[PDB]
Amino acid sequence: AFSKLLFQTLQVLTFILPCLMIPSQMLLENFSAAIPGHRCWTHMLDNKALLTISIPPGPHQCRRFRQPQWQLWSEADTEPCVDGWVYDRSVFTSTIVAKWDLVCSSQGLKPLSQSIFMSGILVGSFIWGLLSYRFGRKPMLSWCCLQLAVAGTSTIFAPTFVIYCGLRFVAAFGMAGIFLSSLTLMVEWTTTSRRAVTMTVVGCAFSAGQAALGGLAFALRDWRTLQLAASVPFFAISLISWWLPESARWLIIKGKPDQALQELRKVARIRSCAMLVVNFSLLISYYGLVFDLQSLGRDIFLLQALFGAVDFLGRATTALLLSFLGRRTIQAGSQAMAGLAILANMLVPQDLQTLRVVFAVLGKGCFGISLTCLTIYKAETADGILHTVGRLGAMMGPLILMSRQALPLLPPLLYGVISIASSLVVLFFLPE
Numbered sequence: 001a002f003s004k005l006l007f008q009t010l011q012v013l014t015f016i017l018p019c020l021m022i023p024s025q026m027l028l029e030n031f032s033a034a035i036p037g038h039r040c041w042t043h044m045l046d047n048k049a050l051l052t053i054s055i056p057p058g059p060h061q062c063r064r065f066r067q068p069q070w071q072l073w074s075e076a077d078t079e080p081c082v083d084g085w086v087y088d089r090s091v092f093t094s095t096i097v098a099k100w101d102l103v104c105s106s107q108g109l110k111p112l113s114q115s116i117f118m119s120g121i122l123v124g125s126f127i128w129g130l131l132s133y134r135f136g137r138k139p140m141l142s143w144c145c146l147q148l149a150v151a152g153t154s155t156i157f158a159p160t161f162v163i164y165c166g167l168r169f170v171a172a173f174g175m176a177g178i179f180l181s182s183l184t185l186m187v188e189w190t191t192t193s194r195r196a197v198t199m200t201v202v203g204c205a206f207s208a209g210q211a212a213l214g215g216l217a218f219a220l221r222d223w224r225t226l227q228l229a230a231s232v233p234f235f236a237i238s239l240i241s242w243w244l245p246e247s248a249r250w251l252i253i254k255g256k257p258d259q260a261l262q263e264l265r266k267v268a269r270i271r272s273c274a275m276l277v278v279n280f281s282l283l284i285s286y287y288g289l290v291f292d293l294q295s296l297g298r299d300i301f302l303l304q305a306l307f308g309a310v311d312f313l314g315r316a317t318t319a320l321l322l323s324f325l326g327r328r329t330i331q332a333g334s335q336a337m338a339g340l341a342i343l344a345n346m347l348v349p350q351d352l353q354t355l356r357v358v359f360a361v362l363g364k365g366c367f368g369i370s371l372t373c374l375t376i377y378k379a380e381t382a383d384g385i386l387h388t389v390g391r392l393g394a395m396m397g398p399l400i401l402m403s404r405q406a407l408p409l410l411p412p413l414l415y416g417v418i419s420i421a422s423s424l425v426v427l428f429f430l431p432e
């Protein structure tokens, strides 16, 4: 009935801005932490032929000859870089991976930074939920926008990796409160019919945001400038999040009808197990793909933009596909297709870059088709549990990438096989 009792155009807009800058802040470490060509610092090179004698074949990116082989050997003439590394600055002027030597034995620290962020989202989305009964949606949006801004601008002045990772947890903690408050305010200040559409617009804004990261990165190579450009813009959103009025529904349930009466006046003046397995799988493979842009194709800038774009195309195709097929076949088929695409990429040769990029973009699009279909199917307690499982999956997606050291193919094989397995679960244990 509250839909009946019930500024929407303006509100969604005051929200397109945070939604356009959120993907940049989550998927920033694909460009700020990119891995540049690295080699051992050798006395013969930093104090073309000199490269060979100083550094063995693989130029190996982790070890160097103790004594130069003017003979050009045994693995015994190799020593780990005791003196450090010399990173290439041709493509990436500055990356965190170069600042805190996140290479070789530490190559897993980059995927962990991306999972500390994701955990910071889970722990945050949980806490902000508890504090939701006590504090309002608008104050929480405004604070969480400032928290993200302060912490995000602050990371540029972080002296050690621990502090960087810690200040990315705080930024993610804040972003969780932004996701919650934004969605909750928009849903609750619109009638139930327009609830869907509004969500489609928010989803499109996120897709444009992913695309825009590729562009922002193409312009701002320095990691410090990229972090400021993806964090500072939040201070403004915090100041422009004041006009948005507090959720009337919250006020009434809270107990304050007089305050609720004022805002409305102003606006006017203006199965479970199968589901969990699918939601975990989609997001443990999605996040794996979106956090591993460099392993997919060599051009990361094009790839991020294309990923953001293939989401819009997918949304639009989804409808026609659903016009003929069903919410179950589409989901399973799309998931299977995404897994197959991830498997194809690992197999496709490095030389054929266009093919590798095409398969990755097909994978991202297909994950988008499955995540759209799942949402419709999901709604048609449980939602909260699923989201908690989905967030856990997104925190174990960037973590499987830590295993690349041991088995390079482990990451793509796991994303592929898990996706294909969920495809079967959707097909057998989900109705229409």
Ligand SMILES: C[C@]12CC[C@H](OS(=O)(=O)O)CC1=CC[C@@H]1[C@@H]2CC[C@]2(C)C(=O)CC[C@@H]12
Pocket (backbone or CB within 6 Å): 022, 023, 026, 027, 199, 200, 202, 203, 206, 207, 210, 290, 371, 375
């Ligand atoms: C799933 C996706 C789009 C991709 C984003 O991935 S990201 O990490 O690059 O921001 C995350 C993201 C966050 C919110 C999601 C959105 C897709 C559309 C969703 C499911 C709705 O209808 C309501 C909430 C929306």
